[PDB]
């Protein structure tokens, strides 16, 4: 299906148990913003946009209400057909050309995520890294699966070994995408 530009609006995803909802917008792939449902607030991926345009968070909270509703409906109709757990595919690569000593961002691209529940964690030399870690929302695929990106701010050095650890229900053992300056 061909075009010039593709905007995703009203893209909603509810799931249970846990009442886990997610509402987002996109444009040519890149996420405009998501809506923090707990805090009823629009959170733009690029702040400049949030200062130029506005999205009433309520318009997103309704699709959640609608999708929460539709979920219980289709669940019964489907004869309580549970979602199947697909295995994710991780990939690690630096945001910009590697330079020893100079600030960079390490990116962990994860694909084939379903359901939209995952744990992408970072490891420096087999050590949990919490700070300087940033994720995207769950971005939709035509598969009606999801992909997600994790970002690690770091200083490139040859004596550092990095790992992207992915924990999903579709996995008996976590993925461990190895990456290092070498």
């Amino acid at each position: 299906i061909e075009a010039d530009h593709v905007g995703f609006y009203g893209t909603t995803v509810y799931q249970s148990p846990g009442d886990i909802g997610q509402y987002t917008h996109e444009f040519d792939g890149d996420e405009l913003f998501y809506v923090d449902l707990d805090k009823k607030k629009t959170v733009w991926r690029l702040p400049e946009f949030g200062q130029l345009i506005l999205f009433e968070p309520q318009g997103g909270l309704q699709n959640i209400a609608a999708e929460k509703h539709n979920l219980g409906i289709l669940t019964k109709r489907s004869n309580f057909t549970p979602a199947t757990n697909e295995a994710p595919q991780a990939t690690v690569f630096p945001k910009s050309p590697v330079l020893l000593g100079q600030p960079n961002t390490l990116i962990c691209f994860v694909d084939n995520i379903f359901p939209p529940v995952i744990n992408i964690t970072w490891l420096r030399n087999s050590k949990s890294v919490t700070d300087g870690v940033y994720e995207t929302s769950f971005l939709v695929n035509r598969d009606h699966s999801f992909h997600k990106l994790s970002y690690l701010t770091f200083i490139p050095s040859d004596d550092d070994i990095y790992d992207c650890k992915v924990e999903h229900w579709g996995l008996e053992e976590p993925v461990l995408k190895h990456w290092s300056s070498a």
Partner: protein, 176 residues
Amino acid sequence: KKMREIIGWPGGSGGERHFVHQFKGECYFTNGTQRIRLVTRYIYNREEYLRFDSDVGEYRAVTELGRHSAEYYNKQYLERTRAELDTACRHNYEETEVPTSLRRLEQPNVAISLSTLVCSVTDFYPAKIKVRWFETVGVSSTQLIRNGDWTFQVLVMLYTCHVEHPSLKSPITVEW
């Protein structure tokens, strides 16, 4: 300065594990807003069972799961839904998507290195870009890489690296 949403409508029924439901609103633009298309999807888990479509003009069952659903949504939301091609699509594009996305220009950082030389083009937006070596063969580039922060990157393998990207007035070059 108001971006609007595409309404995912509530359905009707009749007739412990983990379950998922998704709604997808999608606008496909060409020549700006000359040709605009609105596809709508209702998805239990990963099964799209119901769908609206500008080109079709109405809701249609995609699978057995949306069989009596198509009729319902037509009787109910066909009115407001068909109109969303202008209240949401044609709107968002001309009003909120131009001053932001379509206006975003990000200049690429070029840098060559010996792994076979690798020309690293990074942090550029939009995706539209053309790069050449200064030869036709011995060439091999990676697929365009989406960083997910509204910047792309691509690495062409193989001396000047010529790069022509919209965000630039004059195509920049880098020698080795």
